Design a protein around this ligand. Structure first.
Ligand SMILES: Nc1ncnc2c1ncn2[C@@H]1O[C@H](COP(=O)(O)OP(=O)(O)OP(=O)(O)O)[C@@H](O)[C@H]1O
Ligand SMILES: Nc1ncnc2c1ncn2[C@@H]1O[C@H](COP(=O)(O)OP(=O)(O)O)[C@@H](O)[C@H]1O
Ligand SMILES: Nc1ncnc2c1ncn2[C@@H]1O[C@H](COP(=O)(O)OP(=O)(O)O)[C@@H](O)[C@H]1O
Lengths: 370, 369, 370
């Protein structure tokens, strides 16, 4: 439709949205499916479970929250539908799918089935007449203005390091890791359990995620500071309970680069990036070292970029000038680029109309997708 | 040669005996009967002064070897049957009592499921420990205890005791000296535990459905015997009461949180090999599991939960053959410690040397260095 | 009498001189667990050789020193060899001379490293290394022929005209079935069959050997297979998962016919072989048309000879008749070719003894190559 397109700052752990012309996604909130902690068979319980925002931010020791998109894999389709309806409501969208164009953003390693199922809901339940599915790295590049670059993202579990020069669709250059702060905080609370602090409920763990986003960092001398005797600064919960953190405040996030004791011997995206470097060529590599972009929310850490700088410095050889662009709104960079893409006229032709979806569907998705 | 000191531990108890000892020499709880103090002060304490604990350790360990051993352990090693999640600093306080205070030769820390694997003499295993206050599932990949796949939840008998006191608030027909609903303030949970030992029978799965009917829209309260306490305190408890406390172990409405949920999902993170492996490589430990009519009703519900929508596809058709403990499931862990300390003197190298703790003052745990 | 040791790029094969069945039929793959905070499981190995790694494949990190045949850490394969002796034949390498395999365009340092392991380490009385394609044509019983050799790690067509050196047309090509398996698990990931480790790769390479065949008209067969829902055959895996493969079976080997799928900047296998053909005398290439020696165990495919044949036939003149030489035992004909090759009179003199090596150093590898 010829209206203001819905610019969505999508995501497995944090999904926000706004519109074109807006400089910020008008309603910032994360990805979560908030169900009660009790049997809602008896009347007078937390039924409906459509608890997004203040409803979820209301009941704490009463909500067992769920998460649909797990590393780009969404299974709580109907829960996504009610979250959509929450957005479609006058608290977030104030309009309808038919009333406004919608823009969908994605990342690699996304099976076609997720795209098809989501498009089914978006063109059948909701009916966007002007809907397009896209990436997120493109939008981050739009925000940075660059087109040439080793774009990285640090989502909740979304981590793709694909070197993309001048917007070149290079699928063989795909280097996507599907893990981030999510499981990091999960075993960080396992450390808390190692020192007697159980957080089994979702909200009980959501507070831990608030610590992850609040009191967690990257000690650039991980084994040195680990060997150094910690001091364990005390954290204070919404309950105000005194909780020391210390080594664990940087252990589990430094463990991303050094997955030594995980079992899932991951890489720490710098290794994956070196693999992507190998995929590229020295003439382009030399340029792309300076062309490195970061995104997502897990990038937010004290000593984050500098630790990874030290990592690649230990990795890259001499006379290798590397530059890693990373603003402060890596999350919004996607949304900013979504507004930029919304401002594109080619994008108008890039989107699939509702009728076009009715004509082909999945084939139209994966053919007109790019 | 020498019989290493095999010491069982845990939230509730602390047992011990020689290396290869076949038999419960004694059973000590995880508390210390403090002199002057009318109640036995516990040891399972967190975010607490490790110095008063150090005193408890010195005295308690001293008289402890005098209880189970009646002789100084400075000649042989000490098998320390630990388990993960305990404060490693507290564990080092234990270590300093050992080396820095009693000067024991050398010790070694090992989890319970490891000794369970020693008992079965197998390599891969999907074992759950029915701890006192908690639940503890631990998968093994051919002798390798799986890290990312596990089970650990505050799902033990302590919460059930809280539920029992709630029932005491509800069901209380304590005669005069004739109802007296919880007129008496505190309850001795240890006495309540032995009451459960002599009373808590466990029903059927269909009776579990009867308990579900008792929740909304009552069947078969017998077998049920009243309880007379000394001092004219006699009260009756239905069998449906204790069975309700057993059945509430699987409340998954809107939260999907239970025992089988933990087990199933722990297997969900396992790979293809480990799936069928742990299906056949299956055992269950913990004392709390030893309930009359609970393991088979339990197992039946486990097999029932295999029919949960996300599990027929994924797991589904897998033979869940379970190993059995040759003795009491609780003592079987201590028995596995006895198994290790019995014929493995060669593994003193793996045992934490006193020398290292002397020249170090610490022990780096499973972290760097 | 001697030691006919084959070094398969995937699995392995071995035996004495003149042995008929390969004894060391085991995976020539290296594996180690996640050496972490846990203790040993009743005492066990560190490295896991083949079947041992294949056994406990859920944790043992399936690796390779082999880089399309290029062994990086020779320690791995040499310990594997020691155990291979003391596994299959339990014979020391010092009493029987050894026979090894090789592929053209191999850095000589590899073979010299190998050589010094056999002498300095294994103390073999004599030794020899030759190309697998020679054993293939040896098993055929010819001397004139284009031996299209195809290992599951590499590929190299070998044009020969009466056992003569024609290396200008002989071209190594790092074409592995593992590469196809890479792309295969990738396309499976978008098919909902999202799997990551190498254990998954082992299962699906066996599935590749199960149902992945070679069609005849890839696009037409692709459209019909898209319509042939029954062709999308299923198989309930060792785990509770089942599969669905109709296109995938032949969709995956088209990467060999089309480097475009991987962006190999090469030519398809059929015309690649034809390019190697184009580097010769066309009138002796006539014999090579008749000498269509399809070899290498990675050619055991359904509908592959007619495919390849038809392709090059379209490239060839009408009079230039393709005459396929491809026994299904070509996989074993490598090791069996070496096994019966050991029984050659001249070969019992053609050797590299202890003092012959020591007194010549690694330089003797050059003239003692073939
Ligand atoms: N039935 C089958 N269907 C499809 N492919 C098969 C089948 N049987 C064998 N293969 C192919 O054979 C390959 C392994 O054979 P091959 O002899 O090339 O192993 P190798 O380790 O490379 O031996 P070498 O290095 O000595 O050549 C596999 O990659 C597989 O693709
Ligand atoms: N300060 C922080 N420290 C660690 N992780 C963070 C921080 N801020 C955000 N994150 C993580 O990044 C995620 C947000 O990034 P985003 O790209 O929106 O993730 P997704 O795309 O998975 O929703 C959050 O879900 C959280 O896991
Ligand atoms: N025969 C039994 N029946 C029921 N519960 C038991 C039995 N034996 C022990 N238990 C309980 O099971 C738990 C296991 O004992 P223990 O090893 O001391 O547990 P933990 O390691 O949590 O302390 C204890 O709470 C104990 O009270």
């Amino acid at each position: 439709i010829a209206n203001q397109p819905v610019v969505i700052d999508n995501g497995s752990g944090v999904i926000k949205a706004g519109f074109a012309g807006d400089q910020i996604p008008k309603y910032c909130f994360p990805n979560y499916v908030g169900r009660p902690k009790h049997v809602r068979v008896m009347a007078g319980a937390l039924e409906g479970d459509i608890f997004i925002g203040p409803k979820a931010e209301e009941h704490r020791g009463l909500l067992s929250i769920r998460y649909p998109m797990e590393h780009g894999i969404v299974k709580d389709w109907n829960d996504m539908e009610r979250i959509w309806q929450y957005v479609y409501s006058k608290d977030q969208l104030q309009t309808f799918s038919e009333e406004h164009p919608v823009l969908l953003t994605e990342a690699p390693l996304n099976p076609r089935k997720n795209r098809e199922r989501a498009a089914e809901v978006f063109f059948e339940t909701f009916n966007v007449p002007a809907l397009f599915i896209s990436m997120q790295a493109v939008l981050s590049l739009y925000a940075t203005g660059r087109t040439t670059g080793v774009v990285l993202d640090s989502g909740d579990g979304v981590t793709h390091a694909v070197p993309i020069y001048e917007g070149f669709a290079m699928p063989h250059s795909i280097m996507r890791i599907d893990i981030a702060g999510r499981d990091v905080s999960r075993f960080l609370r396992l450390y808390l359990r190692k020192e007697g602090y159980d957080f089994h409920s979702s909200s009980e763990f959501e507070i831990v995620k608030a610590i992850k986003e609040r009191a967690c960092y990257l000690s650039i001398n991980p084994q040195k500071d680990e060997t150094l005797e910690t001091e364990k600064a005390q954290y204070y919960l919404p309950d105000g309970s005194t909780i020391e953190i210390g080594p664990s405040r940087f252990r589990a996030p430094e463990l991303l680069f050094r997955p030594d004791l995980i079992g899932e011997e991951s890489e720490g995206i710098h290794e994956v990036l070196v693999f992507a470097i190998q995929k590229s060529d020295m003439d382009l590599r030399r340029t792309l070292f300076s062309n490195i972009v970061l995104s997502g929310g897990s990038t937010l850490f004290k000593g984050f970029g500098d630790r990874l700088l030290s990592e690649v410095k230990k990795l890259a050889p001499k006379d290798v000038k590397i530059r890693i662009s990373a603003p402060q709104e890596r999350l919004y960079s996607t949304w900013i680029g979504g507004s930029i893409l919304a401002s594109l006229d080619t994008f108008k032709k890039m989107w699939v109309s509702k009728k076009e979806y009715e004509e082909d569907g999945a084939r139209s998705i994966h053919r007109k997708t790019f | 040669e020498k019989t290493a000191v095999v010491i069982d531990l845990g939230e509730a108890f602390t047992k011990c005996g020689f290396a290869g000892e076949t038999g419960p020499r004694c059973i000590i709880p995880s508390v210390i009967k403090k002199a002057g103090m009318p109640k036995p002060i516990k040891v399972v304490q967190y975010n607490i002064n490790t110095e008063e604990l150090y005193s408890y350790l010195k005295e308690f360990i001293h008289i402890l070897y005098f209880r189970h051993l009646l002789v100084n352990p400075r000649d042989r090693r000490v098998v320390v049957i630990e388990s993960v999640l305990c404060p490693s600093h507290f564990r080092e306080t234990l270590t300093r009592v050992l080396f820095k205070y009693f000067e024991v030769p050398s010790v070694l820390l090992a989890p319970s499921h490891l000794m369970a694997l020693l008992t079965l003499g197998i390599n891969s295993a999907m074992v759950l420990d029915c701890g006192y206050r908690e639940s503890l599932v631990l998968p093994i990949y051919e002798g390798i205890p799986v890290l990312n796949c596990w089970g650990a939840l505050p799902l033990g008998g302590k919460a059930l005791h809280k539920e029992l006191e709630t029932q005491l608030l509800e069901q209380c027909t304590v005669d005069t000296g004739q109802s007296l609903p919880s007129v008496m303030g505190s309850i001795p949970e240890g006495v309540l535990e032995d009451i459960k030992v002599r009373t808590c029978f466990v029903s059927d799965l269909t009776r579990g459905l009867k308990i579900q009917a008792a929740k909304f829209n009552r069947p078969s309260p017998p077998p049920n015997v009243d309880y007379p306490l000394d001092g004219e305190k006699i009260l009756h408890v239905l069998g449906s009461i204790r069975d309700s406390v057993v059945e509430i172990l699987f409340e998954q409405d809107n939260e999907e949180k239970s025992v089988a949920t933990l087990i199933l999902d722990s297997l969900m993170q396992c790979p293809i090999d480990t799936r069928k492996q742990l299906a056949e490589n299956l055992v269950i430990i913990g004392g709390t599991s030893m309930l009359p009519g609970f393991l088979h009703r339990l197992l039946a519900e486990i097999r029932y939960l295999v029919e949960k929508p996300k599990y027929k596809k994924t797991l589904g058709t897998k033979t869940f053959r379970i190993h059995t403990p040759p003795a009491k499931a609780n003592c079987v862990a201590w028995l596995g410690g006895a198994i290790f300390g019995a014929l493995q003197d060669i593994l003193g190298s793996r045992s934490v040397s006193k020398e290292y703790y002397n020249q170090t003052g610490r022990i780096p745990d499973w972290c760097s260095l | 009498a001697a030691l006919v040791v084959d070094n398969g790029s995937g699995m392995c094969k071995a035996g004495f001189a003149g042995d008929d069945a390969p004894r060391a039929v085991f995976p020539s793959i290296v594996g180690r667990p996640r050496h972490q905070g846990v203790m040993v499981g009743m005492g066990q190995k560190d490295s896991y050789v083949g079947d041992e790694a294949q056994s406990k494949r859920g944790i043992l990190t399936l690796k390779y020193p082999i880089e399309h045949g290029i062994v990086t850490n020779w320690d791995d394969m040499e310990k594997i060899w020691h155990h291979t002796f003391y596994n299959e034949l339990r014979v020391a390498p010092e009493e029987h001379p050894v026979l090894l395999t090789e592929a053209p365009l191999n850095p000589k340092a590899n073979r010299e490293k190998m050589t010094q392991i056999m002498f300095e380490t294994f103390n073999t009385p004599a030794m020899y290394v030759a190309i697998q394609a020679v054993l293939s044509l040896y098993a055929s019983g010819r001397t004139t022929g284009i031996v299209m050799d195809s290992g599951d790690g590499v590929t190299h067509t070998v044009p020969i005209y009466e056992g003569y050196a024609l290396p200008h047309a002989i071209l190594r090509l790092d074409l592995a079935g593992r590469d196809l398996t890479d792309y295969l698990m990738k396309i499976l990931t978008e098919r909902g069959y999202s799997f990551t480790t190498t254990a998954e790769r082992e299962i699906v390479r066996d599935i590749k050997e199960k149902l992945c065949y070679v069609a005849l008209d890839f696009e037409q067969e692709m459209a019909t297979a898209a319509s042939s829902s029954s062709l999308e055959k299923s198989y309930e895996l060792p785990d509770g998962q089942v599969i669905t493969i109709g296109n995938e079976r032949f969709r995956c080997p088209e990467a060999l016919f089309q480097p475009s799928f991987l962006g190999m900047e090469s030519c398809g296998i059929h015309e690649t072989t034809f390019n190697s053909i184009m580097k010769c005398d066309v009138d002796i290439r006539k014999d090579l048309y008749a000498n269509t020696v399809l070899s290498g165990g990675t050619t055991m495919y359904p509908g592959i000879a007619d495919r390849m044949q038809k392709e090059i036939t379209a490239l060839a003149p009408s009079t230039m008749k393709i005459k396929i030489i491809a026994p299904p035992e070509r996989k074993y004909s490598v090791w069996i070719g070496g096994s019966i090759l050991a029984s050659l009179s001249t070969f019992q003199q053609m050797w590299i003894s202890k003092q012959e090596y020591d007194e010549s150093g690694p330089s003797i590898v050059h003239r003692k190559c073939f």
